[PDB]
Amino acid sequence: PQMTQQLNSDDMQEQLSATVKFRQILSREHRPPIDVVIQAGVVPRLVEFMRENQPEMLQLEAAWALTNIASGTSAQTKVVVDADAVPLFIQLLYTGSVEVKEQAIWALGNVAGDSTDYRDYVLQCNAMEPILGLFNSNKPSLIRTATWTLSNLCRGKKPQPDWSVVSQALPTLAKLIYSMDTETLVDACWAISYLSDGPQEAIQAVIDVRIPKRLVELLSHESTLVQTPALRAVGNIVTGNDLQTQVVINAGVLPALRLLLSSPKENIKKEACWTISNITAGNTEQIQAVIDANLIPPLVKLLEVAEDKTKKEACWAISNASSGGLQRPDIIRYLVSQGCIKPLCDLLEIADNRIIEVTLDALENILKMGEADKEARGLNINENADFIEKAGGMEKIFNCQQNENDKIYEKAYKIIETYFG
């Protein structure tokens, strides 16, 4: 109350000393007295020190303090939001000095990252314009926070943000990924992964502003804090059509993916398998490109010795590629020569029913090519059938006939009767 007194005081030097105090108590590494401060009702008073007529130093501390109040539970954040502090935060980006903008931008970050509605709210307030205007500055600390806040405005796919509004950030974002600053590179990539999570139009917008080429470079960046969101972003782009996928291929994404398949991080290998599977779902030339990049050997090993979540992803990648054998038979002969059959069978006794369905499709494609070759050449046996039997795979396809799922039994039945009569 000695502090609160100096805050509600009319003395100019007292109101600043009191602001400095509330700031520091909320700037503590340990558990900040967030609720004790709100209890004093000093919120709207600090919102009042963010108005044009306040000294540069009183706005700096007032905003700083108000930022660490929004960085708390949704409730502590709503206390600041309803004290009509948002529009005053935005204006401060237009009128405050650098030090002051750094405080207001950060606060807009916590408010936007609290929920899809506070996000839409900050955007309705037209904060995009002044935020993008901030990057005409050279202060790395200011750039970092602005990229993070910008990040939170693109985030959220359930209630998706206004696209005619957030797509405006792309140009800025395309320049940002050429930054040498690690932290900045992290938030720029997150923002881009959010934006890339949309339809074919979004993806194409990310491509038109020329982001793919640098994004691929970032896959081999030193820090895994950069790689994760960059990988996700490159991943979303290949969920697009064949032409869009080709752009990422021409940027050299494949050699980069080969490196990521040996990543000490397990979730990076998983997302790299995922990414490759969407590339093998492409056309003949793209599947052939995956093969040339030497991606199958390390993808086959993962199918046999890795966390079940990764094995699944690897399964899709190889299964998708096998469907390419109809237009180019060497594709399947190649997968087989690399030993995909054993790791494929060994995955038939897994819990997931959709993976089993995808595994069985691969095996059938392999059995089919095996049959065409038998007839084309002068062979007496379907060689891929033997490989499967010797790998104990025929016994498993046999058990699948007693799986409650319909599609599974019906397919496991077609195989047995057609290739193992």
Binding site: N68, N110, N236
Partner: peptide, 19 residues
Amino acid sequence: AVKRPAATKKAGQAKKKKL
């Protein structure tokens, strides 16, 4: 074949404390 969107969602930190 089939291009699959991601099933698991990803994002950075929702909020940050200034020091």
